[PDB]
Design a protein around this ligand. Sequence first.
Ligand code: NI
Ligand code: NI
Length: 257
Amino acid sequence: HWGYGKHNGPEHWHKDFPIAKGERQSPVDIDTHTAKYDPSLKPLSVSYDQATSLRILNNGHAFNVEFDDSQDKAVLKGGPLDGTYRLIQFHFHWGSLDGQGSEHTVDKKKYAAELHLVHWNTKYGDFGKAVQQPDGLAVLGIFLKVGSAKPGLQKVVDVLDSIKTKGKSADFTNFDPRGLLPESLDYWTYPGSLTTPPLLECVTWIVLKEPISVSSEQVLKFRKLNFNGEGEPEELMVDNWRPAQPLKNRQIKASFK
Ligand code: NI
Ligand code: NI
């Protein structure tokens, strides 16, 4: 009833999910000429040393690499955040062509893809309760450009053949998400939403300034995934991004001058 196809894409989502036209929707365009440095901000604290990855799942929209979130094993703190946010999953949004695929844009530039590391605020006890709160989630977004390979992505690439179609999963232990980060943790932040239905306005977005590079071969393997289930007509999993939404009464703050 929702997807990225010819008849159920982002422009239709409002019919089932009227908050699609809400006041704090994501993604947005990040205008680097109007975002303002905020000295109240602190450095990010990314603490992933004890991360426990479990599984990778093709959910028909993207794939999620899932983590054990039943203890403070992989947490995000600092920055704009108060309290402790636990990593639950990461996933990507990507294009059919190297010139589109990201959800956020920077001065209207689209990247080839965007990585989302999704975290929930431990004060709310579980993910499902967290998404009902304005400060329930923190999503660390990282742009991908095509250039050099990202070595730390390759284990994800090489399992994709085992999860080609919707509903397939595979064991995915011992993956280190630190290998997906750029060098700098400089960031932009703003209040927004989930970028898929139910589009809840529960996210503090933290979007890194520095992209990571992935190879053309790595991206091509993402583009072999399927939206469909096994035994259904093949629909390549590409262009699983929502376009920029109106900023409305929000300000984007920068952690850097
Ligand atoms: Ni549906
Ligand atoms: Ni996402």
